[PDB]
Symmetry: D2
């Protein structure tokens, strides 16, 4: 059981704003975004130094042309000691949450006391691939492969976009274009309402862009884009005519990063640190790849069981909105009412930098718990390939 | 914390760059190694495997989650948890470490861990098509150079980091060439004595347009040694004064390796016979350009974590990123070469970077069984300034 | 020359000249060329498009335009499938060499009605991947900009034309200031001609399918004159001491131009009213990096072929590949600027390279009419060392 | 043409024709062209390379060849920087239209010594990336094969010329078997000519310097590849099942160049040059693009009428074998017996470097007239887009 293992505390978290594809943060690389989130998270822990960080796990999916070990570049960019252990993690969309699980485990096996974990993604700076230049292609037109499509959005087995599998999800659990559109509208409003109230101000670390004075990106870029008129009238994106999944009710392509700082019980009292939360348990699950959309229906109960906590005891859920239908399907399958789900909006309105989103939603979950005066939270995120990861936190 | 047992391991032949295995993708190599290792364990079904950690560095164009593709191609259940890991050249060993940790915290009873790389199939990148470039010649980036072989800070290839290592600790073109010949001869002796045959799962490549079927059983590189050609070849990274060459460096390669890990409880429940027991591990890191000598920190950290002294180890696998890397670390730890890489190393065998961390552990178990040894240690440096080390006991 | 059958220009037309990636960048080179051909034929009272027997059309950067750009221009303009079509490349002189060949084909009796001219879409010039058939096993590769490679780079020196312009400033002693004042004068002349409607007759406006429809009626570059910015900008090819700038060089541009040529017998048969008579021509060439002053050879040769003295020419068109090219040829030939490019030149109007040779001829006929002149001469240098020139009489 | 100034051929020369990515693939198009020009000039006793005033050179796929391929050919062959140089593109007819334009430039008195011909390096045709200047934000992108785009595809229908060859087989009733047995006969004629040394005079062997032993390329690469059983058993190349056009009975893709040296009557007498042949006339013609296959049935009578020569007076024809079916159809339409056609084999067996073939077949034609003691020859060559060019010569 968890209680036979040492405790792990979150003592801070931070995230960049989430920029739009080729948008506000498109000039920064994935490690520049990662360094920014790590540095801002560490600056929040009173009593802890960046040189105290021993190990880093950082998610990143589309690592092509990012260079050697994205996590190492995030760590050194943030002013961490060159002695820091750094590992990049790829569990597609869940990478940012699995990096946190692996960070927690490294404290629990006793191999570190201070760990930074999270994820980063610069989808704007994902390149195109030329796959056959070494052996040559003697004759015929050839292809420049979009690295986002190939390594981020296509299921490897069926060679099928995730949106076509989200469409399969809509067929599977009975959710219409209208049901997905009105959900999409509601989470955009929740995200806009949070923005208007300043409820992202704590978690977000504004970015200063050089160039005489500086430009500052302080807000997530996608929430303001809501136009309910065009949203309900838009042509569907994956099945012309009878499709239900659209770009407005799907997650966008985005840039962003998020980071949490984990410490062991020894270091927490030895440095007399203020803990923000405790990790109570986690769960990974996986099923048929084309059914990844509902893999949180397995991961979430497994994480609750690991934590020894009931689904009704949870005050707030973060169920990552890869698509609107993903949130609706898992809510129906679990019997979770939407009034406890994605209370400041979700990825459909906020953005989905795929390697970071597992940590982004945990960052937001902590804000939701403080803002709405809850204690227990559960984050669940599906990933292409059939999997999902889930985590259970107690606000301290 | 619960004990972690290795019940089997397997590896592909290591193919040469654009060579015997260049038609196979990294998930194809990885799946091959996984189901080969699982077939060696009687009493364990492939459906018993709950989680997979697989190393892979140059993942571009491999498709979503290389480790998931390795697991599903190997016949594992769609319920398996699959994570791809990149710690550059240490990826295959760090995957095994994460796998053992997952057993130790009680979240899995059967884990497959390892690594794969198809350097033959690493693409080139066009990085500015999305925003465009109005006028000017543009660059196609070689993914091997950018994401595998170039240090991020210095923007210098690994062979220049290895020239630092030579000047830092005092090894000449002669001492590195003599070492390369010794490890080539050690690799050729093992092939002839059949000492790789257990650990290598041969790959069948059937041609069927009237073409003949092909079986790859050997590692492709060891046979290529020519000491006369080796000694007289020109330097590769610094003209005239350089000590590092292509023959005394590791090559680019294709390969995969896997281990099956089980918990103390599952080993008893299913009546499994263990091959080894993981005793401890250690990750370490220092200045990025000095990554060549990071094993000098990782290896003692892994020895200390395991409660085992340096003089107790029967054999070391110190991954030969370059001949000079083995020579430098052998100097700083005080290890005699008579207890290092006893069946050859990556200079002669090949270096599919994502896989080598698990490749040298696989070969290490073959060293201990053949030499009738008890305690083995493997450490592997990685670009960025880090290294990973692991200590096993044969049973 | 006079001892051969006479050749008459019965019409001419040009597109507006669009800026690089500007107002005409959505049209392909054959679409621009077809537009110019159709508009030239529409001006000839008593001649049908079906009477056109043969086409010569210039085009330099033909990559990805498809088979035989000239044939595509011809069919796109509505000419018969019986029409003989040949694409011509003499780099920047292509459009004028095309007209020379068209005249010769009438002179040797093989046609009575010929359309000739040139077209270029520099906006739609592709990038090249040169080594994908045989492969490149390892290393960063390049994507070659087709404009630089096939248009603007001298093959022997592998230096861009701007550096040949600097050779010209050094060889004939023209400072940054002299080049800048020339550039301002030619922009002013182009703007004046524009505003006075003097390009209205020669230009065939282009309608783009719509948003609603957009019509392009004016050359895009002339309005861009800013004298203060032009005098203060940094030099574009040699830092610090350079003299050649983007303002005082020709730009990259899109456009086409065409003339309709007929024999003397066909003029009478169809009772056609000629606009001008071709009196003679000349090509010349010298050292490739000195292509800038090859018109100082080709212009005297064309005048001698035409049996016309230099002083009798009422207006010259000396193509402004750079401001320094006009200055140097005016100096070498002793031609006063008051007789040169009277409605502006390519520094201000634009330089679609395969078309400019025919573009300046169309403009020259307009100049001779507007300024009440009879004899004109067009001269255009080209990458590689060459130049072409042609003498016309306005009737 | 009789009332027009005379034009003499004083020499000709061609490279060996190399297979696609074969014996000559390391040479650029201007390197091949320079070789042919220099070799042709070396044959003229009493004429210097510095006497050449003007050059017309065919070349179709000029992408990445650099400025003015013809100029590069001329300067590479050692001609003066004063030489006037123009590159010509009438697709497959380029090399013969170049010679026509060269003859005209003598006839109008603007030159007395002209070199004309053509060159193609199909091995070194690049691929194109068409949308890098404006960018392409998202999606896989095409790399266009320059051979397919600029050499082999009719611009109107976007149809490969092999498909229009099938239209020819259907239009004129030529079976798979008629095309195959024609192909075998022309391979046999090429082999027989090769073996008897009948190409030795016209071919200029190429010496490739070793980077490694030097390599001399002496013979055309394709004739030896004839395998009659495999030629008859191979699948069709363009229409599965019912197709009649195959790779063996079509022209290959090839590298090579050819050149002729032309002089005026005055210059022939001034330098006391020995003429090889006289150009008697020429003709170009065109029709519906997809019927380019039988455009030589228009060009040949037009060139004969221009020359004042009857079809029956011709001792030998070169009808360029773009496809076997092209030679069969033009022989049928014009009533020309095969025993007068391509007496040393044609492009199906020798190869088809498209910018050079128009000049290559004229060089070979001069060799056939000498070997067979003929006097009057006619070369005709169809070209993509609907055209053809033809030329009549008299051996002196
Ligand atoms: Cl998965
Ligand atoms: Cl590292
Ligand atoms: Cl030239
Ligand atoms: Cl045509
Ligand atoms: Rb701090
Ligand atoms: Rb903040
Ligand atoms: Rb959206
Ligand atoms: Rb088994
Ligand atoms: Rb085996
Ligand atoms: Rb080696
Ligand atoms: Rb008309
Ligand atoms: Rb008329
Ligand atoms: Rb007009
Ligand atoms: Rb300009
Ligand atoms: Rb000679
Ligand atoms: Rb010869
Ligand atoms: Rb053939």
């Amino acid at each position: 059981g968890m209680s036979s293992l040492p405790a792990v505390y979150i003592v801070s978290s931070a995230r960049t704003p989430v920029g739009s594809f080729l948008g506000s943060l498109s000039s920064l690389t994935a490690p520049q975004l990662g360094a920014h989130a790590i540095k801002a998270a560490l600056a929040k822990v009173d009593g802890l130094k960046p040189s105290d960080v021993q190990e880093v796990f950082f998610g990143n999916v589309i690592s092509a042309n990012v260079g050697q070990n994205p996590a190492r570049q995030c760590a050194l960019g943030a002013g961490l000691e060159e002695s820091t252990i750094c590992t990049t993690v790829n569990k597609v969309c869940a990478s940012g949450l699995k990096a946190i699980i692996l960070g927690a485990q490294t404290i629990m096996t006793g191999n570190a006391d201070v760990v930074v974990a999270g994820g980063t993604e610069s989808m704007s700076n994902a390149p195109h691939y030329l796959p056959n230049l070494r052996t040559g292609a003697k004759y015929g037109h050839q292809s420049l492969v979009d690295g986002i499509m190939k390594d981020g959005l296509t299921d490897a087995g069926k060679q099928e976009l995730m949106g076509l599998q989200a469409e399969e999800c809509a067929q599977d659990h009975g959710f219409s274009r209208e049901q997905q559109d009105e959900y999409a509208i509601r989470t955009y409003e929740k995200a806009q309402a949070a923005q208007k109230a300043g409820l992202f101000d704590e978690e977000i670390a504004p970015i200063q862009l050089p160039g005489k004075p500086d430009v500052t990106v302080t807000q997530d870029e996608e929430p303001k884009n809501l136009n309910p008129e065009k949203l309900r009238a838009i042509k569907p994106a994956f099945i012309p005519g009878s499709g239900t999944v659209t770009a407005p009710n799907s997650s966008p392509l985005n840039d962003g990063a998020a980071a949490v700082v984990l410490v062991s019980e020894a270091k927490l009292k030895e440095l007399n640190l203020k803990p923000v939360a405790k990790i109570l348990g986690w769960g990974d699950a996986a099923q048929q790849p084309s059914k990844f959309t509902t893999a949180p229906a397995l991961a979430i109960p497994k994480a609750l069981k690991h934590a020894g906590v009931g689904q009704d005891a949870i005050d707030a859920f973060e169920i990552n909105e890869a698509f609107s239908v993903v949130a609706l399907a898992n809510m129906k399958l679990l019997g979770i009412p939407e009034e406890k789900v994605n209370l400041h909006g979700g990825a459909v309105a906020i953005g989905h930098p795929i390697g970071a989103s597992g940590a982004r939603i945990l960052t937001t979950l902590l804000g939701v718990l403080k803002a709405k005066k809850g204690k227990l939270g559960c984050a669940g995120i599906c990933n292409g390939g059939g999997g999902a990861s889930a985590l259970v936190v107690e606000l301290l």
